[PDB]
């Protein structure tokens with residue numbers, strides 16, 4: 001029950017509510033799949049931090065599927081960018097490309113390969129963050145300036161260390177749930 005307490009204590013209510021909604025979609029109980037719960041919250045918060053550091057970015061993640069696809073289709077219709085096969089996380093209006101955001105407890109390159117093999121689209125930019133301050137991005141183009149990426153890396157490390165002080169990090173990292 002400690003993972004749920006930590007989640008509600010370190011993530012703001014909006015993020016927690018969105019994550020619980022995602023889990024209700026999956027038919028998953030956040031009191032049981034606690035690690036997936038924390039992972040969902042962390043990925044949501046990274047996506048929102050990313051989109052706020054720009055308005056440069058359009059947030060697709062966190063919307064219900066109806067709204068997410070409505071926004072994707074609006075962007076495609078008004079830009080001509082090819083429609084992604086999977087719901088991406090953001091749209092970058094400056095570079096004019098969709099972005100998939102990855103947050104992993106494994107090596108950034110392994111998860112990068114996983115994401116790139118999955119989405120199978122040369123056009124969606126991919127950006128992977130770890131909990132150790134590492135990143136990897138398509139073409140090594142990290143989109144953001146050093147300060148914003150620093151802010152995200154700090155937040156992720158801090159989440160890791162909070163989990164560690166509560167003896168939660170070990171279970172969370174050995175689990176691939178949420179990636």
Ligand SMILES: N#Cc1[nH]c(Br)cc(=O)c1O
Nearest residue numbers: 087089101102103178179
């Ligand atoms: N939608 C969605 C989604 N689901 C998992 Br699992 C990992 C992600 O990075 C992501 O954007």
Ligand SMILES: [Mn+2]
Nearest residue numbers: 061087088089
């Ligand atoms: Mn997503």
Ligand SMILES: [Mn+2]
Nearest residue numbers: 089100101102
């Ligand atoms: Mn993502």
